Amino acid sequence: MFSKFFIERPVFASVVAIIISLAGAIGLTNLPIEQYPSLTPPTVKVSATY
């Protein structure tokens, strides 16, 4: 039932593939580029002088 849908309509199935691939490539463009998923603790510096 479900797979026969796309076998009868190949252009439809291919378009869904390109949509996922293209919109995912859109996600590839707008993604931050770190080395680790922010595995370093954030720090706060308090400095005073006497």
Partner: protein, 50 residues
């Protein structure tokens, strides 16, 4: 869906090393089948190996 429109049948050119490796693979298929049949009869003797 991409197979129904592009997968042709006749293909009598499977090269030398590709045809050789596939018949290489059929040997292990039977040895595995006989190996499984060997294990299924000697039951407890292979439960302790686990």
């Amino acid at each position: 869906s991409l197979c129904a429109l592009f997968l042709r049948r006749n293909e009598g050119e499977p090269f030398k090393f590709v045809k050789k490796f596939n018949d290489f693979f059929d040997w292990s298929t039977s040895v595995f089948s006989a190996g499984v049949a060997y294990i299924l009869k000697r039951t407890i003797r292979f439960v302790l190996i686990f």
